[PDB]
Design a protein around this ligand. Sequence first.
Ligand SMILES: CCCCCCCCCCCCCCCC(=O)O
Ligand SMILES: CCCCCCCCCCCCCCCC(=O)O
Lengths: 129, 129
Amino acid sequence: SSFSGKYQLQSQENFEAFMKAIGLPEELIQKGKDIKGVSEIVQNGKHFKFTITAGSKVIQNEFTVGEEAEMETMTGEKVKTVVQLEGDNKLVTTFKNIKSVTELNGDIITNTMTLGDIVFKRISKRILE
Amino acid sequence: SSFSGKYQLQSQENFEAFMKAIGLPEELIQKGKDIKGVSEIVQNGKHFKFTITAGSKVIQNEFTVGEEAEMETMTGEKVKTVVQLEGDNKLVTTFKNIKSVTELNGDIITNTMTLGDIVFKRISKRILE
Ligand SMILES: CCCCCCCCCCCCCCCC(=O)O
Ligand SMILES: CCCCCCCCCCCCCCCC(=O)O
């Protein structure tokens, strides 16, 4: 129903392999790979505000689903794309050669980013306030 | 008694002036000045683990009060200093020409950094899980 919440990272797979494939420096990969931080989502209808803790970087993006928006990526690049809401619990987008799926089931968000044969998966649990 | 918990930034004063004075790149100042993230402290006696969201950076430091510690600063430089306990609810340290005071008051933390005539003040609030 609503994506709003603070989410603490529980586990992830292929962080290092994904970040190397997009060109992050090895120095930032090593600094960030063990951080299990908190990301925040605020949903207002079709409007989303994301404050994402990704490794050692915090990225703050905002978009309305179905509308073209400029979003900052891990590399600092701003890509123009459209995120769609599938059902009430799946956010889907593609940018560059990455497919991204954000799925909410109960209190668990699973984010799956696919690049070639690397599936980068993050599992985060809502903080029950 | 215990600093442990997750804290969300509520307000801060003089972020830009302080970050300029320590020499942070202007591009990082502009993107970080409006981020209100979550920091986590894990305390075990005199031993502290900090996962700090500061602007657009995540900084992870560890240390024991009264022991010499090597800590990463906002610029990525590593400094050696000693963190002291003042009372039971204040951590104090000096490094370079900065004095940092971290004060716990129930569910509120006030971090005050003084650099010459600039007082960079952050007020955060415990996330109640
Ligand atoms: C598509 C623009 C964002 C680029 C950043 C990529 C790094 C992973 C992003 C996943 C965050 C999605 C929200 C769930 C919470 C989380 O996993 O932190
Ligand atoms: C003393 C070096 C720490 C790194 C410098 C980063 C600048 C901001 C540090 C303040 C964080 C203190 C913890 C309280 C929670 C918070 O304010 O996020």
